[PDB]
Structures are given as C-alpha cells and as structure tokens.
Design a protein around this nucleic acid. Structure first.
Lengths: 112, 66, 68, 55, 100, 96, 119
RNA sequence: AGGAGUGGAGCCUGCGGCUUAAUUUGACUCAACACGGGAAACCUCACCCGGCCCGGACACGGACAGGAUUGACAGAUUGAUA
RNA sequence: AGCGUGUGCCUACCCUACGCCGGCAGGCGCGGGUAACCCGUUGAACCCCAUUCGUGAUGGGGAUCGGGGAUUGCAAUUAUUC
C-alpha cells in the first residue's frame, strides 16, 4: 500500500519503488526516485508532507517514522522509471513511435 | 413399560398433548389428519401437499420428475 | 418512464416572522409577561421555552413532554 | 427517525459485512492469514507481499 | 542470563548469515551458546483462480510464502546481547530477544 | 453538507495543526480515528475536505480506500483568515 | 361438537399464560424465538404489532391491520384477528383461526405465484 | 490392451425452456453448463414491489438574521418508534 | 497418517483439551494455545478380527413424508444446519 500510495503521489517526480527498514524506534522508509529535488520539493517541504501523511494512515508513533528520498544510480535499468518516463512523454503529446524509440535508444545506451 | 419420550414417533401431539408411538392404521389415520390440518388452515406446507409437490425446501426445476 | 400513482408533496417550512415576539409579551415597565413555560431540563435550562400545544406541552430541544 | 433507520441493519457477519481493503468489493475475498484482499487484487499484489509462485 | 534470540525471516541466506554473525558474536566474546536450532519452515499457501471472471479453462495460481524460523539460546549478560543484536542486520531478518 | 460549525472548525484547525489530514472512504464510520474527542463523523471530514478540493485550496490523493489531503499556500492563507490565527505561526510542514 | 385445542390446553388457558410458561408448550424453533428475547431493536415492530393487534373494535371480525413481518409467530393472543401479510405485490387478508398457532404469518401468504406450464 | 466409469435410477448442483412483480445477470463445440472463486434466509444484489435520505462539490443571482435553515414526543397516517 | 488451520486494524466472528449434566445434537463450570510449546503422540476412515443376517426389493438402498428436540443469527416459513 506504501508502494501504491507513493506511485499515485510521486508519478511525475520519477518514482522507482520504496525500500523499508523496521529498525528499532525508527521505521526508516526510503523513497527511491530519480529527481531528488522534485520529491523533497521546497526546502524539504513535500517530503515532510509524506512523513506527516504516512503515520496518520499506518498509526506509527508521533515522530517514530522517517522518510528518506534518495536517488537511483543508472536510472535507465529500472523498468517502472522508464514506463513512468514514457507515459509522461505520451501524455506530453509526443507521437508514440518517437517516445518508444526514445526510451528504447536511452536504455540500450544506459547499458541494458 | 419405561421407554422414554424421545424414543416415540408421535411426541407432544397437537389434539391431546400426549407422547405415544402411533402404529399402522393409527399412523395412516393421524398422517391423513396432519396433512388435512395444513390443507384446512391453508398453510403453505399443505398447499404443497394438495398440488402433489416437494415441500421441504428442494429445487423442483430438475428433480421429482414423474 | 411514466408511473401511475402521483408523487408525495414535500414538507415546506411554515416560517413565522418575529417568533420571539410571540414567546414573550413586553411590559410598560422594565419587566416581562412570558406566556410560554420554560423547559425544566438539565440539557436546556432557562433559555429554551416549551411548546403551547392544544392537548399537551412539549420541549423542542431535549424532547421533554408534559400532558394535561 | 431516519438517523435510527439509515444504518440500522446489522453488518457483523456475511460477505456484506467485510470487503476488500484494495478493491472495496463484496466478492472473491481471501480471508486466510488476515489478508482480506480480493482474489483479483491479491493476484496483482502477491509479488509485493512476498507470495512467490514455485509449485 | 539464559537469554533466548528468536530469528524469523522470509529469505534463508539473509537469516543464515545473521544467525551465523550472532553466533560469531557469542564466540568473539567467548560465552557458551546452544547452536542455531532450526524450527520448521511455514509455507503459507494461497491457491486462487487465475481468471478475473470464470470464462477460461479452470487454471489456478498456487502462491507460497516460506517463513524460516531459527532460535539461538545464550548464557550471556544482557548488555553484550543488546550490543551484538544491533550489529549488521538486514531487512529480510526479524529478531526477538526474550530475557527469561 | 450541513454540519455543526463546532465540527467544521475542529476539522480546519486539525488540517492547520499539521499541513496534512487523512480519512478512510467509509461514510458510516461514526468517529474519525484521529479526531475522536470532538465527535466529528468521518463523512463530515470527506465533504469538508472535498469543498476545499473543488475550489482548489487542498491537494487530493487516494490509495485503495484512504483519502490523503495536502494543504496548499492559498489554502494556508484561507485557513489562518477563516480560523483567525497569528500570521507569524505556520502549519507543521514549513517547520524544519 | 368438540372445541379446538393446542397440545393439551384450551384457548383461555393459552391466553391466561406468561411467555415464560408459553415457551414449554409449542415447538423448539418458537421456544428459541421467545427465549432469544422480546425485541428492543427495530424488530420491536413485533411489539408495535402487539399494540396494533390490541385495537380490537366492537362486535365484528376486526379491520385488516397490515404487516411486512412474516417472521412473527401466531400467538394465542393474536387468534381471531384480521392481518394483511405482504408478499411484494399483495397485502393478503388472513383471518387466523386457532389451529394456526406456532406457524409464522408469512406461512399463509404465498410469496411466489403458483406455476402452470405452457409449451 | 484394459481399469474405473458417466449416459439408466434417486437426490445435490449449473444451463435452457416454462412460469413469474421479479424469478438479476455474463458465458453456448473443444475454449459455456458445482464456471464468475456464484455453498445468495438479511446483507451480498445488480432483479422486482413499497418508503426515507442527499452523501446535488463548486461559481452566479433572489432569500435572509425584523431568523435562510436544521432537527424534533404525542395524535393522524404508515409496515415501521421513516 | 500426512498436508494443514487456529484469538483477526476496521473486523464483530479463533482451535480446543479437561470435569459434570443430556439418549443426542447440545448445554454447562473450567484451563492451554497468537503455536515443533496447546488441541495433538492429531488413537481418521477403508482395512484388520469376532458375532447376526441368507438371495427375499431382505438387516440391500435411504428418497419422500409426519411428529418432536438442539445450535448460529436481528430473522430460518419456501423446512440454515444438526
């Protein structure tokens, strides 16, 4: 549900999955999105909106959950990062042929 | 002769409030009455009996074919 | 599509202009001629007046009833 | 009163009482191990929960 | 002093190298330990139809989810255990520590 | 949705206390799990929030069965005007 | 010639009897039904029918008092009354002569239409 | 080559037809017919017969605090203490 | 014997030993188990051995149908199930 909620939220911001630690006193959940600047927003604003919202749904103790939003190294080899890249090329109004080659040419360059 | 009430076929009867094992011609005459009661009071159970149908919650769509 | 039996008339509110003017009767001097009984309840004290019904008395807030 | 009526009918048992935590559907409910997730819904989220197909 | 670690995982190799690293910690500080007692695996099993409707030949997914469970019994002081249990744990693993 | 101003203000204050508020999509759940003290029903929450969504004061998100609302800047100004608070203090999302 | 009974009791002896004692006479389902309790729920429409039956007017068969309640036991208290048992279509009039005690109200109004067969 | 059979019989069950206020429906050779995880008393429920509710966001206009509007026990009436 | 399941977020509803009462379904006091810990060494059936029956629609077969009795549930009648 975390992974789904984050997909519906950080779709345009280059979401590539979450990784959760259940470390003692600190449920450390790491968003793994491409554009780090756009997920933390204005001076770590939106990322705090995500901390505030998660514990309210999952009932974690007040300030006993911390969200990090680090970067995917070689983002060409994540499928859901290329599928979300492609869907926003298509919804941009680009011809499907152009967009698909654009992805396919990018990930074969990236080293797939 | 000490055979208990739970062991009889006509337990807590409607006309007399009596426990008694009712035998051949009695059982036929008292079966007749039990259906002819339900026929007389127009109760769903007897109406099913009058029309010659299955009463105890069966599906008649497929089974009970003469 | 077309149904036979006619629809149910909806409730319209019988709005009464200056309903406080009926609740009280202002005196010549600085005092009162309060016609309506005040509800002797805990939920509502001296503020809420009771209803002047034609075969009983009824409170509109806490749903208290007194009969003749 | 309508406030008494509106939700009067009990919802303590039967598939009209419980629903999918994803789908919000009254059918194909997997109750086993406290999933409570629809048989289509769980077939989508089986991987993400940790339900590998092997045998 | 008879303090009981209950390791439980989904993934074997992750729990196998942890229970090994805790039994390292028992030997590095040289206190007696009952070995990694292997509790039986729990294969959770959901066998659902494949089709969202009923409009194909009657196929069935057979999902498993294995839950491996190990336990390590120590004769240790409490603080040495709360030190070792912190060191090098990974997300596949789930660690309890019962005092008595 | 006609609801008490007491409830409505206990909603808008709770949205302004954080910069965020949630609710499960269940009209019939008679007590909001967060705000239980002041007995606010769960549908009052959804309708009071979709009011702000329609005239664009709050950001919408929805996963499975749960609404997630994020307060936006013009919504912040509307709420400190509509609740009459100090313009000094902010919701607990501009705090670092 | 003879007067109607129930088990081994006369109607005024049925009518002069508490529910605590009325239990141990008729059948197991109804005994359970009475033991489960007298209704404090919306099913206090049982008790509301107990109030609407106790508007028996002067000498004739009483007026048709209608119900959706098919899940109601024909008590000896009811007997002689004129009840409208609902089907979906028809509030069927039923005068409840005293052999119908123990039976449900819905047991006397067919919710289905009897089938006949054509080609 | 054979084994158990099924097709016969009784019942459970799905489908057509018939019936019906309604008997909700999708699916019709293999690849529809104990299939929709569909063993439905209520809910489920889509069907049909009754009766409440707004859970009609929001922008614009008349109303309107000299009170827009809300809710409300009897009695009637209702199936209902809607 | 071997797969297994078992007290639930909301979710209300868990598996059950043990002692009395009941012919029985069941009811009652009373503990264990969130489980290789308790049900449970899971004393399962078919099978095995020993009586009765004897080619008879028979002690095969258990449909329909009458009366009664218990449980779950807000409610079982068009019979929930036993």
């Amino acid at each position: 549900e975390l992974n789904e909620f984050l997909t519906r939220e950080l779709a345009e911001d280059g979401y590539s999955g979450v990784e959760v630690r259940v470390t003692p006193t600190r449920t450390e959940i790491i968003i793994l999105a491409t554009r780090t600047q756009n997920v933390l927003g204005e001076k770590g604003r939106r990322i705090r909106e995500l901390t505030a919202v998660v514990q309210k749904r999952f009932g974690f103790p007040e300030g006993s959950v911390e969200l990090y939003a680090e970067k995917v190294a070689t983002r060409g080899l994540c499928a859901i990062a290329q599928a979300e890249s492609l869907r926003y090329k298509l919804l941009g109004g680009l011809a499907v042929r152009r967009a698909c080659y654009g992805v396919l040419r990018f990930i074969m360059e990236s080293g797939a | 002769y000490k055979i208990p009430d739970w062991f009889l076929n006509r337990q807590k009867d409607v006309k007399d409030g009596k426990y008694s094992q009712v035998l051949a011609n009695g059982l036929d005459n008292k079966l007749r009455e039990d259906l002819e009661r339900l026929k007389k009071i127009r109760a769903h159970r007897g109406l099913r009996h009058f029309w010659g149908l299955r009463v105890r919650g069966q599906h008649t769509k497929t089974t009970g074919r003469r | 599509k077309s149904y036979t039996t006619p629809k149910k008339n909806k409730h319209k509110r019988k709005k009464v202009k200056l309903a406080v003017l009926k609740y009280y009767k202002v005196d010549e001097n600085g005092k009162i001629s309060r016609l309506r009984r005040e509800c002797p309840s805990d939920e509502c004290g001296a503020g809420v007046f009771m209803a002047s019904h034609f075969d009983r008395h009824y409170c509109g807030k806490c749903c208290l009833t007194y009969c003749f | 009163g309508h406030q008494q009526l509106y939700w009067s009918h009990p919802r303590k048992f039967g598939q009209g009482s419980r629903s999918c935590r994803v789908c919000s559907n009254r059918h194909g409910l997997i109750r086993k191990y406290g999933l409570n997730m629809c048989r289509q819904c769980f077939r989508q989220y089986a991987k993400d929960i940790g339900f590998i197909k092997l045998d | 002093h008879r303090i009981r670690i209950t390791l439980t995982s989904r993934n074997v190799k992750s729990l196998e190298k942890v229970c090994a690293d805790l039994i390292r910690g028992a030997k590095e500080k040289n206190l007696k330990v009952k070995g990694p007692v292997r509790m039986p695996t729990k294969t959770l099993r959901i066998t659902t139809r494949k089709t969202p409707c009923g409009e194909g030949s009657k196929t069935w997914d057979r999902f498993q989810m294995r839950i491996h469970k190990r336990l390590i019994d120590l004769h240790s002081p409490s603080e040495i255990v709360k030190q070792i249990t912190s060191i090098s744990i990974e997300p596949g693993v789930e660690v309890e520590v019962t005092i008595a | 949705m006609l609801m008490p101003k007491k409830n409505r203000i206990a909603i808008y204050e709770l949205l302004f206390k954080e910069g965020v508020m949630v609710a499960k999509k269940d009209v019939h759940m008679p007590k909001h799990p967060e705000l239980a003290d002041k007995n606010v029903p769960n549908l009052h929450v959804m309708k009071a929030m979709q009011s702000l969504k329609s005239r664009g004061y709050v950001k919408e998100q929805f996963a499975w069965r749960h609404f997630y609302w994020y307060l936006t800047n013009e919504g912040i100004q509307y709420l400190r005007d509509y609740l009459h608070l100090p313009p000094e203090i902010v919701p607990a999302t501009l705090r670092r | 010639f003879r007067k109607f009974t129930y088990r081994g009791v006369d109607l005024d002896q049925l009518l002069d009897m508490s529910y605590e004692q009325l239990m141990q006479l008729y059948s197991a389902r109804q005994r359970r039904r009475l033991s489960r309790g007298l209704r404090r729920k919306q099913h206090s429409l049982l008790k509301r029918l107990r109030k609407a039956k106790k508007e028996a007017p002067p000498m004739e068969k009483p007026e048709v008092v209608k119900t959706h309640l098919r899940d109601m036991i024909i008590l000896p208290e009811m007997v002689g009354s004129m009840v409208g048992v609902y089907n979906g279509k028809t509030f069927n009039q039923v005068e409840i002569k005293p052999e119908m005690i123990g039976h449900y109200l819905g047991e006397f109004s067919i919710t289905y239409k009897p089938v006949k067969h054509g080609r």
